[PDB]
């Protein structure tokens, strides 16, 4: 179905680097549909429940921690397939598993500075859309290129 | 230094596909991005920030076509940014704009133009205030403050 | 080589202004623009060729390129014929979706590429020079 | 006024250094409809009667017989005031004139390497796409975001 | 044609990870890279290629800048590419500079404005004779000449 | 560790289609840092020792006499597993055989022209860097953004 969402946050490096609109650019052009953007700065206890399945690894409060370092941009893409679309468009979590030309493969070198935070599952995507925006911030809208970019 | 403008693009930015573009043009002249959001204001919400069009005769066309579709609101902050945006943008009629401006490599109508941006100092204040809580203002360093300005 | 391969924008590929881009891919790995034209086929000059209801609704740019392997070649830089199993770094890994609106076609073998040509163009519109950086391109 | 139309022709120059894809894009992501495409090689016949109001400067033999030296992409736009926004995409005849963002200001250096021809008014542009284009090469459709590119 | 330019990539140029674009620009625009390294200059190299403005107060500033970081040293080959070659950097000061223009794409600050371009043929012939040896200029027919000159 | 260092050199046909700036871009934009980068045109004897283990086998006095058609882009990149992520940012040795963006995949198409040289290994990298470079064009900085591109 043509209406799935995920998630998409740009990590605090992503953002100090300058690459807001680069990533924002490989979503647009692919063909999936913008339905939320917002640059915020997450409380602790939000990324802790962001990162909750990860709470027993000895990384945890590193990890909270790293991402406390500035604004993040959080992002949902909505389209067809576009949770597993998105986690190849972003490449291996670790950067140097990467593809070129995907984000991590064009941009980033450190699992620990990787730029980008992927849902890991339709499962997961609900989970972490419904934790970072209201559903009003959820914006409801055709895509003007719909009928151009699916047949069904 | 502190300055700070407001940049929207227009539900035709948009829909367009033309957020990256348009964020990347900032983001590469060395400005910060201080809020970012996709909203979908009220009626009542854009005629407070068309306000100065009140009484001219496309203000009823203007705000419907701004309720068309979702709208990208931001603050970028920097060195002289309000003037400087305004120059990144173009001129407000896109047959009037220098290609290598977001409306001269990108726009062709006057009432499609894809962005907005605030005319002065005192008005992206007000539009600052209109469109974002204060929470939703970012307070950062940028990485690259020191290469980008001399003070 | 003078090998040449049969290139097609889908007209979901011209109306989301990817011609440009498109071209440019092509352009850039070394491979020579031998014809190019921007057309609307007939139904039947399409059959020799919801599916065929769309290849109507648009125009179609048909190109040809001369290069060495650029059949085999060309098929990697459109990439897979469903975007959802393409690279990103392909044309259908960075602009598609859907197996219906992959963007673009190209030949699947070096002869069907001259059958598609000869179906296409009149050998008038395929022109022939000789690309300025050959030598830096080829040995 | 929506669809006035004009030529633009990319030179055999253009053509030979790999300029035809980012000459395309410019055009594309201002909002103007590609209404015909082609590669071709005009006669000498044809390119004197394109050039027939400069047959009396002095460098009009030179003109022609570069503009037979390779194959030209000829292209014909549509959109509102194209053919005097497409001289200004185009940037000025002699490229050191030329600001940059321009084609001719990004790509070129001399006025007879220039990259680039575009049409100088509506009625010579008519004049143009007539004389380069059968009337079934031109393709008649309505661009996908018309509504989004003008308010008519 | 053939007249030369040189070109520097300042520290915040190279720091800010600007050195493939702006010799994109260059590139793009036909013109031909006769010489490019990136070195550290002493203060006496700075010094001497900002001698007209030893008189200046902001001289030693401008010096110790310079000495901040790395610096891409370049000289450019074509026809008025010293001219050219402004016009590509814009305006000193970068909010002067028009967008489409190196510091009107990336710069706001003059103190931070990524390049440094001759500002005359004349004062070109001195600069890349201070920045280069001989053997480091490069003499080669651009692959492209015959297409990019009548 | 991120002070390891490879060798890479833009072969004539790169320098010559135009390729130095993009090949420059890609490396930047990983966040790997340019630590000495010079236009040269080696002597043979010079580029003898550098191909010196394919001193026998047959491509030698063709592919020696190629890398002195024109002037090279040497460099050196530095950054963790800089020497293996700068051979994935290259492409496979045959272009034809480098997926999409890649160097090779992107821009070139024959082996004898694949534009880029890039050293095989980080001990081939030590030794390729001393011969090509001076200890003092070595350049010693620190990124300006090394910690929001390494967690070290």
Same mark, same amino acid.
């Given at each position: 179905?043509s ?11 992503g953002v ?23 640059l915020?700065?997450?409380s ?16 945890f +409060? *590193? ?12 992002? =949902?893409?909505? #389209?067809?397939?576009? $949770? ?15 593809? +070129? *030309? ?12 990787? =730029?980008?935070? #992927?849902?890991?599952? $339709? ?27 699916y047949?069904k």
């Amino acid at each position: 179905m043509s209406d799935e969402q995920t998630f998409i946050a740009i990590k605090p490096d992503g953002v100090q680097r300058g690459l807001v609109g680069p990533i924002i650019s490989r979503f647009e052009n692919r063909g999936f549909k913008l339905a939320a953007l917002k640059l915020c700065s997450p409380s602790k206890e939000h990324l802790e429940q962001h990162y909750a399945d990860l709470s027993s690894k000895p990384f945890f +409060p *590193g990890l909270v921690s790293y991402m406390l370092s500035g604004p993040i941009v959080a992002m =949902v893409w909505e #389209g067809r397939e576009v $949770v597993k679309t998105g986690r190849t468009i972003l490449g291996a979590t670790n950067p140097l598993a990467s593809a +070129p *030309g995907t984000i991590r493969g064009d941009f980033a070198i450190d699992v620990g500075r990787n =730029v980008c935070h #992927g849902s890991d599952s $339709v499962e997961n995507a609900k989970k972490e859309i419904a934790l970072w925006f209201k559903p009003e911030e959820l914006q409801k809208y055709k895509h003007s290129q719909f009928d151009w970019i699916y047949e069904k």
